[PDB]
């Protein structure tokens, strides 16, 4: 007998439940329609604590407070940006958010498996810019191994997990203050 997709999703979430925090190392690539304007495969990290996360990827350091506010520093533009992201925008930068909070918006189904892995498919009940989310997990213990988000326009955001570890994440990792970026331009997008 084998678990439902919902069952596998809730077994995968257990791997991110360390109370003091979880560190995820990954590689990610965005493949744009017709491969025009794609972003190359590169490396990143996510620190999770409760509903908060700190994302390091590309030129960006981003923090989500677990409520409604995303703050991110872009080292290439020298801007500190504060915004109210949509639920879809959060999944696009942190696909594992589908595991850390209750989500009312997606139908769940099992997709064809891989060698030693399972594949869970999530499709929105209401249009939201996302066509499908695909979470890859290890067949032994449902440990997340990767994710792919396909946008309605065909963009593929592909994430490969290269490590999951324990960490003691302090309050300070989930805040960005203007003093920490000499000369930074603050842009309030709220």
From TrEMBL:
The record's Pfam families line, in alphabetical order, gives: LolA_2
Q: Which domain of life is it from?
A: Bacteria
User: What name has this protein been given in UniProt?
Assistant: Outer membrane lipoprotein carrier protein LolA
Keywords on record: Signal
Q: What is the lineage of its organism?
A: Bacteria, Pseudomonadati, Bacteroidota, Bacteroidia, Bacteroidales
């Amino acid at each position: 007998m084998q678990r439902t997709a919902e069952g596998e999703l809730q077994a995968a979430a257990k791997h991110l439940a360390n109370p003091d925090g979880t560190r995820i190392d990954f590689q990610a690539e965005t493949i744009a329609p017709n491969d025009m304007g794609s972003s190359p495969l590169s490396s990143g990290s996510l620190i999770l604590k409760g509903n908060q996360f700190r994302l390091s990827f590309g030129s960006i350091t981003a923090v989500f407070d677990g409520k409604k506010t995303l703050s991110y520093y872009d080292a290439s533009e020298n801007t500190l940006n504060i915004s109210h992201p949509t639920n879809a925008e959060l999944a696009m930068i942190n696909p594992l958010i589908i595991l850390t909070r209750s989500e009312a918006g997606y139908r769940t189904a099992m997709l064809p498996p891989t060698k030693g892995g399972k594949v869970i498919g999530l499709t929105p009940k209401t249009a939201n810019g996302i066509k499908q989310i695909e979470l890859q997990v290890d067949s032994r213990d449902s440990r997340p191994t990767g994710a792919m988000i396909t946008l309605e326009d065909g963009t593929k955001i592909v994430t490969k997990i290269t490590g999951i570890s324990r960490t003691k994440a302090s309050p300070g990792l989930f805040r960005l203050m203007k003093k920490d970026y000499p000369g930074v331009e603050v842009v309030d997008l709220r």
